[PDB]
Design an enzyme around this catalytic site. Structure first.
Site, PDB file in Angstrom:
ATOM      1  N   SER A 198      41.492  68.626  40.297  1.00  0.00           N
ATOM      2  CA  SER A 198      41.471  67.197  40.636  1.00  0.00           C
ATOM      3  C   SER A 198      40.967  67.038  42.069  1.00  0.00           C
ATOM      4  O   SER A 198      39.857  67.511  42.366  1.00  0.00           O
ATOM      5  CB  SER A 198      42.860  66.638  40.350  1.00  0.00           C
ATOM      6  OG  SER A 198      42.838  65.225  40.254  1.00  0.00           O
ATOM      7  N   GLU A 231      41.958  63.666  29.901  1.00  0.00           N
ATOM      8  CA  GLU A 231      41.976  63.480  31.349  1.00  0.00           C
ATOM      9  C   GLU A 231      42.620  62.157  31.743  1.00  0.00           C
ATOM     10  O   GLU A 231      43.218  62.054  32.821  1.00  0.00           O
ATOM     11  CB  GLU A 231      40.550  63.556  31.913  1.00  0.00           C
ATOM     12  CG  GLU A 231      39.901  64.948  31.877  1.00  0.00           C
ATOM     13  CD  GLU A 231      40.467  65.914  32.924  1.00  0.00           C
ATOM     14  OE1 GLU A 231      41.216  65.463  33.814  1.00  0.00           O
ATOM     15  OE2 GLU A 231      40.148  67.126  32.861  1.00  0.00           O
ATOM     16  N   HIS A 262      45.837  65.411  32.417  1.00  0.00           N
ATOM     17  CA  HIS A 262      45.333  65.829  33.718  1.00  0.00           C
ATOM     18  C   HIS A 262      46.343  66.719  34.428  1.00  0.00           C
ATOM     19  O   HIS A 262      47.465  66.295  34.716  1.00  0.00           O
ATOM     20  CB  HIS A 262      45.054  64.571  34.543  1.00  0.00           C
ATOM     21  CG  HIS A 262      44.319  64.808  35.825  1.00  0.00           C
ATOM     22  ND1 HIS A 262      43.007  65.235  35.871  1.00  0.00           N
ATOM     23  CD2 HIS A 262      44.708  64.647  37.115  1.00  0.00           C
ATOM     24  CE1 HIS A 262      42.618  65.320  37.132  1.00  0.00           C
ATOM     25  NE2 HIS A 262      43.633  64.974  37.905  1.00  0.00           N
TER      26      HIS A 262
HETATM   27  C1  LIG Z   1      47.943  62.234  38.128  1.00  0.00           C
HETATM   28  C2  LIG Z   1      48.367  60.881  38.624  1.00  0.00           C
HETATM   29  N1  LIG Z   1      49.342  60.809  39.733  1.00  0.00           N
HETATM   30  C3  LIG Z   1      49.894  59.421  39.800  1.00  0.00           C
HETATM   31  C4  LIG Z   1      48.863  58.327  39.798  1.00  0.00           C
HETATM   32  C5  LIG Z   1      49.270  56.946  40.258  1.00  0.00           C
HETATM   33  N2  LIG Z   1      49.640  56.808  41.667  1.00  0.00           N
HETATM   34  C6  LIG Z   1      48.576  56.646  42.649  1.00  0.00           C
HETATM   35  O1  LIG Z   1      47.418  56.616  42.278  1.00  0.00           O
HETATM   36  C7  LIG Z   1      48.892  56.482  44.124  1.00  0.00           C
HETATM   37  C8  LIG Z   1      50.203  56.518  44.579  1.00  0.00           C
HETATM   38  C9  LIG Z   1      50.488  56.342  45.952  1.00  0.00           C
HETATM   39  C10 LIG Z   1      49.451  56.131  46.854  1.00  0.00           C
HETATM   40  C11 LIG Z   1      49.790  55.963  48.304  1.00  0.00           C
HETATM   41  C12 LIG Z   1      48.114  56.088  46.383  1.00  0.00           C
HETATM   42  N3  LIG Z   1      46.961  55.876  47.287  1.00  0.00           N
HETATM   43  O2  LIG Z   1      46.932  54.970  48.118  1.00  0.00           O
HETATM   44  O3  LIG Z   1      45.918  56.692  47.183  1.00  0.00           O
HETATM   45  C13 LIG Z   1      47.844  56.257  45.034  1.00  0.00           C
HETATM   46  C14 LIG Z   1      50.366  61.900  39.622  1.00  0.00           C
HETATM   47  C15 LIG Z   1      51.822  61.549  39.620  1.00  0.00           C
END
Ligand SMILES: CCN(/C=C/CNC(=O)c1ccc(C)c([N+](=O)O)c1)CC
Ligand SMILES: COCCOCCOCCOCCOCCOCCOCCO
Ligand SMILES: CCN(/C=C/CNC(=O)c1ccc(C)c([N+](=O)O)c1)CC
Ligand SMILES: *[C@@H]1O[C@H](CO)[C@@H](O)[C@H](O)[C@H]1NC(C)=O
Ligand SMILES: *[C@@H]1O[C@H](CO)[C@@H](O)[C@H](O)[C@H]1NC(C)=O
Ligand SMILES: *[C@@H]1O[C@H](CO)[C@@H](O)[C@H](O)[C@H]1NC(C)=O
Ligand SMILES: *[C@@H]1O[C@H](CO)[C@@H](O)[C@H](O)[C@H]1NC(C)=O
EC number: 3.1.1.7
Lengths: 537, 535
Positions: free
Chosen positions: B200, B326, B439
């Site tokens: 990733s 994915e 994923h």
């Molecule tokens: C494989 C997916 N993951 C979770 C995806 C959803 N949460 C986010 O995308 C996310 C979460 C927090 C922040 C600060 C962020 N940001 O500002 O970049 C983006 C794993 C648990």
């Protein structure tokens, strides 16, 4: 009279007729050929709606086909059976509004369901007298009464200055309607049932059948409809009023006629051949599957576009049979796309594919064209000449026939109609077009009309049995609104096409196979996405 | 004291720890500093090399995790908790870990360097699924993994400024790579055979080292699992990075030239920045991250697309691949109708709404194009199809099609490329069945966790994990994942633009397939960029 066959003499509204006794493989039929149903649309009547034929005196001889409507004659492969079978087989004339009747011999006892054939030919050509439209087999084997009419084509049938009185447009469709009124008044004299009339036609003839469905004055003249490889909706069957006006005005300029009255008056002094010689030259782009002079959305015969009318009409009363052949597009490639010939394999390059998409989708912006090329490319073999050849065929067939048919079937069904859908997949053993063209546009007709039953024509025995099955389907539909035999439940059944299940049947030498989805993924591209893409670009 | 556990690197002396792997012991050196702690005035700044130290530095335990957001969607659920920090959070987090065999390799051994994922906002090299002992013990590899700064700390950028130039989390990775060059020979590693692998955001990082010349002299081969430097989420333009940093500074109350803005940000406690990190995205979206690598004209001299289109990769060997589903993981984190606790059967209306969230840059016309391409027009309203199509949109747009684009461009420009799709769903997986193979759930197999009897994997999964460890380490050794002694006909062929061959990784033997979603990826990679431009 006195020495003639008494069972070949009949009176219609206009006077007495003498028909002829023809041989069909299983016995005789009665034919009444060249019956006039309109005043000759000549001189001051060129471009005018037809007037009913005035009564004649004496016994009119109805033993031979009458003149073919003046039209362009195809010269691409002179003397080749595959083209000549579509060309005029009687003298070309503007005096051509005649129809033909085939009935059992002797004529039937009980009123008999009537089939009315409307030929295709891109609205620029065709004749009811062609061999492939021979009604003798349906009359003899199925007992049908079969009617076919000549209607004006080309400029004579469809040149329009919309809103004028001297060229209102769609007069070729009015010719067809007048023949339908003739059947209502007179078919009982032949033993035909005016209360059971089924229209059927192919390509532009199918589009014509669809326009009678959509035009209120025609709807009281028939009860059921068959549309073979054509639709009133889609990209070629109609033009706007503005586009018809533009095409009529250019044609006038090209033959030297630079106020609508004066322009039409000068056109009426031009020899018929001069109009034909310039007909093809008014198309807005290099194209295939586009025709210069076609039905016009006039606000009269067609109160709105066919797409609007099928999207909003009430069709609870309607039973329709619709279908396509397997290779709708291949025929058109050899009349215009560089790289394609009947005489070689037509394996094309990627460059020739892109150029061909512009010709086959002449209204596409650059983005729409690229969308077409991207959808139809095989991205594992993007340059394979065989795939590109077949993709070009599929582009032209999908865009002009298959997806317009899928759309019509889906709209008619969602609006209350009983729809039956087919794909015709058998290639005639006698076909003279090359094998790469598959089952081309128009090559189911000879099987529907039962020509394989003629021993002279060298079809196979299985093709004879196949033809008989097809005639059964068509006449059963004419009789009942249902192609299935009320008896034989052993043979597989033909289900209605529905929006939810989208069922249709394969028509080939093997028993009916039911399939789901008429090219559903690809036609969503053509029917849902492309209009939004073109509107944005 | 065990001499196998004492090593001298350029900075001083280290004491490692002997660990148990199922087949025998391994030597682990955990928590080795490779940079000055990036704290106080060094926040947002490029890393500096660690100063020497006296005595023996204790490298027997994992060091702190880089400060980052902690996921709380399903508290206490293994499927989410397995990705959360498993050590204390600190900005003092620039440490790396080295697993070697016990006894130390007698000859120089190929080095694998793991770069973790986590959307560039999260992750740590201490997670259980990145445990290097299995690769070290079974395959004899030397395995290295580093912490790098994530979130605002690693990627907040005021492009062109001296105090926040961007990409410092990638410079953290690069400093660790050069540390491996300078020091790995003391562990028995071969600095002349270094393979990067990551998943990733870590795969995208690997890709960006491929595309930045100063990193090219620090490694020889690369593995990109489920991520790419190209594509819609892995980079931002300089203008958009400036906008997000400025907005974040506004949110934490920092009023102005870059110097004063960054100074006030430097006074903010760490959690104050994380509290607003997720609030600067320009649209409601999924699979989009606020602070990611920036096209600075420095680390990245141009966009990844421009660089993979024009680069010469003739001496590069790359292994790239995707998992079967994915997209499914991301739906439960934003898309109305989706949840790990029900089958997430969605309506058509919810499908349309999800496409705007999953393709947040799409115009109306482009969103309509996506919906009509992914609808099954035989069953346009079937909830199961619409759910699975939503997953496919997210996975194809963000991973599968970017991977296909990268594989094809690299192959066309001289690179040796091997491609896979991973299709086995772990018997131990805790997410629901409708998510398929989500994923990130190939990692535990590559690292050999099934070989641990205590984790209750099936015997076939142990066999399968051993097979994958061998592909990966064979690729590290030779640039070719095929066993040079296995003489059967299940050979993994190179991916090429002509034949487009890839293989499926699952419990059954290698099978060769042609075309990685070729038709669908042509829509994403060829058509839709022309459509968003036009309208
Ligand atoms: C494989 C997916 N993951 C979770 C995806 C959803 N949460 C986010 O995308 C996310 C979460 C927090 C922040 C600060 C962020 N940001 O500002 O970049 C983006 C794993 C648990
Ligand atoms: C195997 O999956 C194919 C699913 O096709 C769905 C077709 O729906 C039409 C929706 O219009 C989308 C607009 O497209 C533009 C062309 O882009 C390339 C299409 O790429 C291959 C299509 O075969
Ligand atoms: C099934 C394919 N047919 C051939 C198609 C190509 N020719 C035309 O399209 C055409 C030809 C001539 C005219 C006047 C015209 N027009 O004015 O519209 C259109 C078979 C004969
Ligand atoms: C087929 O013949 C036509 C004209 O004779 C020519 O233009 C075309 O290039 C030929 N195609 C092939 C594949 O030979
Ligand atoms: C049928 O085949 C015979 C050859 O036995 C041939 O003489 C005849 O002309 C053919 N007829 C047609 C219509 O093809
Ligand atoms: C699944 O559960 C969530 C929250 O409990 C809910 O919002 C969603 O609508 C549910 N999905 C379905 C298909 O019922
Ligand atoms: C494996 O299963 C047993 C139950 O037989 C259980 O006691 C043990 O905790 C499980 N281990 C893991 C890692 O889930």
């Amino acid at each position: 009279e006195g020495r003639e066959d008494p069972q070949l003499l009949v009176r219609v509204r206009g006077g007495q007729l003498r028909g002829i006794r023809l041989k069909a493989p299983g016995g005789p039929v009665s034919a009444f050929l060249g019956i006039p149903f309109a005043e000759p649309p000549v001189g001051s009547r060129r471009f005018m709606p037809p007037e009913p034929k005035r009564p004649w005196s004496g016994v009119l001889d109805a033993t031979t086909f009458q003149n073919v409507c003046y039209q362009y004659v195809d010269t691409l492969y002179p003397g080749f059976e595959g083209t000549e079978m579509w060309n005029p087989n009687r003298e070309l004339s503007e005096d051509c509004l005649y129809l033909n009747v085939w009935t059992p011999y002797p004529r039937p006892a009980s009123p008999t369901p009537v089939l009315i054939w409307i030929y295709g030919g891109g609205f620029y050509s065709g004749a009811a007298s062609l061999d492939v439209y021979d009604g003798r087999f349906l009359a003899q084997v199925e007992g049908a009464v079969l009617v076919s009419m000549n209607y004006r084509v080309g400029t004579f049938g469809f040149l329009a200055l919309p809103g004028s009185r001297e060229a209102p447009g769609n007069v070729g469709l009015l010719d067809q309607r007048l023949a339908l009124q003739w059947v209502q008044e007179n078919i009982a004299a032949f033993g035909g049932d005016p209360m059971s009339v089924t229209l059927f036609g192919e390509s532009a003839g199918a589009a014509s059948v669809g326009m009678h469905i959509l035009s209120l004055p025609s709807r009281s003249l028939f009860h059921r409809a068959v549309l073979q490889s054509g639709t009133p909706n889609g990209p070629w069957a109609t033009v706007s009023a503005g586009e018809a006006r533009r095409r009529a005005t250019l044609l006038a300029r090209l033959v030297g006629c630079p106020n609508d009255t004066e322009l039409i008056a000068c056109l009426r002094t031009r020899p018929a051949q001069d109009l034909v010689d310039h007909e093809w030259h008014v198309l807005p782009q290099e194209s295939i599957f586009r025709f210069s002079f076609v039905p016009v959305v006039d606000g009269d015969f067609l109160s709105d576009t066919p797409e609007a009318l099928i999207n909003t009409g009430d069709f609870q009363d309607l039973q329709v049979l619709v279908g396509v052949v397997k290779d709708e597009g291949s025929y058109f490639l050899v009349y215009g796309v560089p790289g394609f010939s009947k005489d070689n394999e037509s394996l094309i390059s990627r460059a020739q594919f892109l150029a061909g998409v512009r010709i086959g989708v002449p209204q596409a912006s650059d983005l729409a064209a690229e969308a077409v090329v991207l959808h139809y490319t095989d991205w594992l073999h993007p340059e394979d000449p065989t795939h590109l050849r077949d993709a070009m065929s599929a582009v032209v067939g999908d865009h002009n026939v298959v997806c317009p048919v899928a759309q019509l079937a889906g709209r008619l069904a969602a609006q209350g109609a009983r729809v039956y859908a087919y794909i015709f997949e058998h290639r005639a053993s006698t076909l003279t077009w090359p094998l790469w063209m598959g089952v081309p546009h128009g090559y189911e007709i000879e099987f529907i009309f039962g020509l394989p039953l003629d021993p002279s024509l060298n079809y196979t025995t299985e093709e004879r049995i196949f033809a008989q099955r097809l005639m059964k389907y068509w006449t059963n539909f004419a009789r009942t609104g249902d192609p299935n035999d009320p008896r034989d439940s052993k043979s597989p059944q033909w289900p209605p096409y529905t929006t939810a299940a989208q069922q249709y049947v394969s028509l080939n030498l093997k028993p009916l196979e039911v399939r789901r989805g008429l090219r559903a993924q690809t036609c969503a591209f053509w029917n849902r996405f492309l209009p939004k893409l073109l509107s944005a670009t």
